[PDB]
Amino acid sequence: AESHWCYEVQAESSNYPCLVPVKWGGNCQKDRQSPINIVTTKAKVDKKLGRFFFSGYDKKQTWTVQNNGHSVMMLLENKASISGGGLPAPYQAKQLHLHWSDLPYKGSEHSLDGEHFAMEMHIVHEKEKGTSDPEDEIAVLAFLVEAGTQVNEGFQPLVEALSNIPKPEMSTTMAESSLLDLLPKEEKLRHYFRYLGSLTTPTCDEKVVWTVFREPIQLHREQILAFSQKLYYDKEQTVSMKDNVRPLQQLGQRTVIKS
Ligand SMILES: CC(=O)/N=c1\sc(S(N)(=O)=O)nn1C
Ligand SMILES: [Zn+2]
């Protein structure tokens, strides 16, 4: 590898050389990659995909949030977990991070019926294994974010914290908030899409069971813009953090199912 991985926007916005997505190493060139476009009418209903159970999602916490140089990430340190969702085990929550742009019609990694959303939020969980690595070691819950004029009060603690972590490796503490504050209303999360894929940054390991919820989070345009306005890819603050999005990958011979 001749330089550090980057997103296209970083290569375009700086003279410092870096490895763009089509040139990424690791497992990034293998054939079960994410994100993908989901043709919603072609995903078959699987009745075994029931409701999710969220643990620790309703509890108010003061989360640590940090700029890791390619996103903003909340550290969930196993303080939450999930089960159900047609998942084979409970999964422990590790981190939450986001991908975004500064235009309403792009910013998501996945697309639904060829539509990208303003952001996409990933909550990353790790499988509770038994004795008897796997294709489903990691469960990522993906939520699409739609831009509008509705102020999302739940997001405010996160949005306000952004001012405090402009540069990579900076961390801060968010005001009291729960994970549910960040999500659509729980009852609306019964409809989701499911497929097997990869992590969307190097080394892009093919060990993710993906869930993409049908119901979008509503965020005000200016709450979304706060991400590109307050954050930077680099300590020199030369490239505002936005378009931290991997281009679409081919489904190949994989199948997408839905609840
Ligand atoms: C270690 C870890 O969780 N990193 C991640 S989370 C992730 S993502 N964007 O959720 O698929 N991609 N990568 C590389
Ligand atoms: Zn992600």
Side-chain angles (χ1 to χ4, degrees), residues 77 82 88 119 174 183 192 213 229 259:
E77 323 199 299
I82 58 176
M119 315 180 82
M174 289 163 57
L183 298 189
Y192 56 89
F213 290 88
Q229 287 160 343
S259 64

PDB file of all heavy atoms in Angstrom, residues 77 82 88 119 174 183 192 213 229 259:
ATOM      1  N   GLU A  77     -19.363   1.169  24.177  1.00  0.00           N
ATOM      2  CA  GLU A  77     -18.661   0.318  25.111  1.00  0.00           C
ATOM      3  C   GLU A  77     -19.497  -0.736  25.764  1.00  0.00           C
ATOM      4  O   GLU A  77     -19.627  -0.796  26.953  1.00  0.00           O
ATOM      5  CB  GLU A  77     -18.071   1.233  26.204  1.00  0.00           C
ATOM      6  CG  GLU A  77     -17.562   2.542  25.722  1.00  0.00           C
ATOM      7  CD  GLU A  77     -16.631   3.155  26.683  1.00  0.00           C
ATOM      8  OE1 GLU A  77     -17.079   3.424  27.820  1.00  0.00           O
ATOM      9  OE2 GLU A  77     -15.468   3.347  26.277  1.00  0.00           O
ATOM     10  N   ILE A  82     -28.486  -5.700  21.263  1.00  0.00           N
ATOM     11  CA  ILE A  82     -29.667  -6.000  20.475  1.00  0.00           C
ATOM     12  C   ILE A  82     -29.880  -7.504  20.394  1.00  0.00           C
ATOM     13  O   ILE A  82     -28.939  -8.288  20.522  1.00  0.00           O
ATOM     14  CB  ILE A  82     -29.604  -5.395  19.036  1.00  0.00           C
ATOM     15  CG1 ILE A  82     -28.363  -5.903  18.262  1.00  0.00           C
ATOM     16  CG2 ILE A  82     -29.674  -3.860  19.096  1.00  0.00           C
ATOM     17  CD1 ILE A  82     -28.310  -5.425  16.816  1.00  0.00           C
ATOM     18  N   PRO A  88     -29.010 -14.412  14.735  1.00  0.00           N
ATOM     19  CA  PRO A  88     -28.789 -15.733  15.354  1.00  0.00           C
ATOM     20  C   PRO A  88     -28.339 -15.704  16.828  1.00  0.00           C
ATOM     21  O   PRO A  88     -28.301 -16.755  17.482  1.00  0.00           O
ATOM     22  CB  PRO A  88     -27.694 -16.345  14.480  1.00  0.00           C
ATOM     23  CG  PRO A  88     -26.932 -15.182  13.946  1.00  0.00           C
ATOM     24  CD  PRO A  88     -27.882 -13.999  13.882  1.00  0.00           C
ATOM     25  N   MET A 119     -27.888  11.512   5.005  1.00  0.00           N
ATOM     26  CA  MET A 119     -26.863  10.861   5.844  1.00  0.00           C
ATOM     27  C   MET A 119     -27.221   9.394   5.997  1.00  0.00           C
ATOM     28  O   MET A 119     -28.329   8.979   5.662  1.00  0.00           O
ATOM     29  CB  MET A 119     -26.812  11.451   7.259  1.00  0.00           C
ATOM     30  CG  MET A 119     -26.853  12.969   7.382  1.00  0.00           C
ATOM     31  SD  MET A 119     -26.786  13.459   9.107  1.00  0.00           S
ATOM     32  CE  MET A 119     -25.021  13.393   9.467  1.00  0.00           C
ATOM     33  N   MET A 174     -20.908  14.271  25.349  1.00  0.00           N
ATOM     34  CA  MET A 174     -22.226  14.789  24.977  1.00  0.00           C
ATOM     35  C   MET A 174     -23.101  14.988  26.213  1.00  0.00           C
ATOM     36  O   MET A 174     -22.958  14.260  27.206  1.00  0.00           O
ATOM     37  CB  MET A 174     -22.929  13.817  24.032  1.00  0.00           C
ATOM     38  CG  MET A 174     -22.346  13.741  22.632  1.00  0.00           C
ATOM     39  SD  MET A 174     -22.912  12.245  21.791  1.00  0.00           S
ATOM     40  CE  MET A 174     -24.705  12.428  21.875  1.00  0.00           C
ATOM     41  N   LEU A 183     -33.028   7.780  16.996  1.00  0.00           N
ATOM     42  CA  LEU A 183     -33.671   6.818  16.112  1.00  0.00           C
ATOM     43  C   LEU A 183     -35.095   7.228  15.757  1.00  0.00           C
ATOM     44  O   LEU A 183     -35.688   8.057  16.449  1.00  0.00           O
ATOM     45  CB  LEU A 183     -33.668   5.433  16.770  1.00  0.00           C
ATOM     46  CG  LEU A 183     -32.282   4.828  17.049  1.00  0.00           C
ATOM     47  CD1 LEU A 183     -32.413   3.376  17.482  1.00  0.00           C
ATOM     48  CD2 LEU A 183     -31.394   4.945  15.833  1.00  0.00           C
ATOM     49  N   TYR A 192     -37.515  -3.632   7.704  1.00  0.00           N
ATOM     50  CA  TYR A 192     -36.108  -3.501   7.379  1.00  0.00           C
ATOM     51  C   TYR A 192     -35.689  -4.504   6.304  1.00  0.00           C
ATOM     52  O   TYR A 192     -36.381  -5.509   6.059  1.00  0.00           O
ATOM     53  CB  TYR A 192     -35.233  -3.672   8.624  1.00  0.00           C
ATOM     54  CG  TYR A 192     -35.448  -4.976   9.358  1.00  0.00           C
ATOM     55  CD1 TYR A 192     -34.712  -6.129   9.033  1.00  0.00           C
ATOM     56  CD2 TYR A 192     -36.379  -5.058  10.387  1.00  0.00           C
ATOM     57  CE1 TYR A 192     -34.921  -7.323   9.718  1.00  0.00           C
ATOM     58  CE2 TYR A 192     -36.598  -6.240  11.077  1.00  0.00           C
ATOM     59  CZ  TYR A 192     -35.864  -7.364  10.747  1.00  0.00           C
ATOM     60  OH  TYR A 192     -36.095  -8.521  11.432  1.00  0.00           O
ATOM     61  N   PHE A 213     -32.944  -0.055   7.772  1.00  0.00           N
ATOM     62  CA  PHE A 213     -34.329   0.203   8.135  1.00  0.00           C
ATOM     63  C   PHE A 213     -35.014   1.039   7.061  1.00  0.00           C
ATOM     64  O   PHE A 213     -34.413   1.944   6.503  1.00  0.00           O
ATOM     65  CB  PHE A 213     -34.411   0.865   9.514  1.00  0.00           C
ATOM     66  CG  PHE A 213     -34.035  -0.066  10.633  1.00  0.00           C
ATOM     67  CD1 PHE A 213     -32.712  -0.194  11.030  1.00  0.00           C
ATOM     68  CD2 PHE A 213     -35.000  -0.857  11.246  1.00  0.00           C
ATOM     69  CE1 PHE A 213     -32.361  -1.095  12.055  1.00  0.00           C
ATOM     70  CE2 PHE A 213     -34.661  -1.758  12.266  1.00  0.00           C
ATOM     71  CZ  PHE A 213     -33.335  -1.866  12.670  1.00  0.00           C
ATOM     72  N   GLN A 229     -20.009  21.567   8.485  1.00  0.00           N
ATOM     73  CA  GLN A 229     -19.564  22.882   8.958  1.00  0.00           C
ATOM     74  C   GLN A 229     -18.596  22.816  10.131  1.00  0.00           C
ATOM     75  O   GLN A 229     -17.744  23.674  10.255  1.00  0.00           O
ATOM     76  CB  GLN A 229     -20.746  23.804   9.296  1.00  0.00           C
ATOM     77  CG  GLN A 229     -21.487  24.330   8.073  1.00  0.00           C
ATOM     78  CD  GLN A 229     -22.915  24.819   8.375  1.00  0.00           C
ATOM     79  OE1 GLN A 229     -23.504  24.501   9.416  1.00  0.00           O
ATOM     80  NE2 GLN A 229     -23.486  25.559   7.435  1.00  0.00           N
ATOM     81  N   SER A 259     -38.214  -7.898   6.147  1.00  0.00           N
ATOM     82  CA  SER A 259     -39.226  -8.307   7.109  1.00  0.00           C
ATOM     83  C   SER A 259     -40.638  -8.042   6.576  1.00  0.00           C
ATOM     84  O   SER A 259     -40.829  -7.168   5.734  1.00  0.00           O
ATOM     85  CB  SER A 259     -39.018  -7.566   8.426  1.00  0.00           C
ATOM     86  OG  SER A 259     -39.207  -6.174   8.250  1.00  0.00           O
TER      87      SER A 259
END
